[PDB]
């Protein structure tokens, strides 16, 4: 991923009042994935074969 000039200029402080980036800013990256699986129901019990 590539950042932006707005992000790099807002990372530091210097913003005036009611600007949001008055204090130095920090960012974090989060990744979510969705996957398929098979659930087996038999003999009154459940579990993943794989």
């Amino acid at each position: 991923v590539t950042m932006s000039p707005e992000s790099v200029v807002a990372a530091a402080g210097g913003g005036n009042n009611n600007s949001g980036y008055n204090e130095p800013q920090r960012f974090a990256l989060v990744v979510i994935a969705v996957n398929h699986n098979v659930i087996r129901i038999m003999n009154g019990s459940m579990g993943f074969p794989i």
Binding site: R40, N43, G44, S45, G47, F48, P49, I50
Partner: protein
Amino acid sequence: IVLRGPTLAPTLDRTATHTVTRPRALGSFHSTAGPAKHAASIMAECKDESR
């Protein structure tokens, strides 16, 4: 492409099914018995001084 030992999850069996809870065994150790007995007292039918 990556090759590795496939992950196999064991299944079947049964957990927490039809609780019975009957492990008790009767029996204990204490005194045996008591050897006590009594008679029917003593009767007395005598008078008139029959020698």
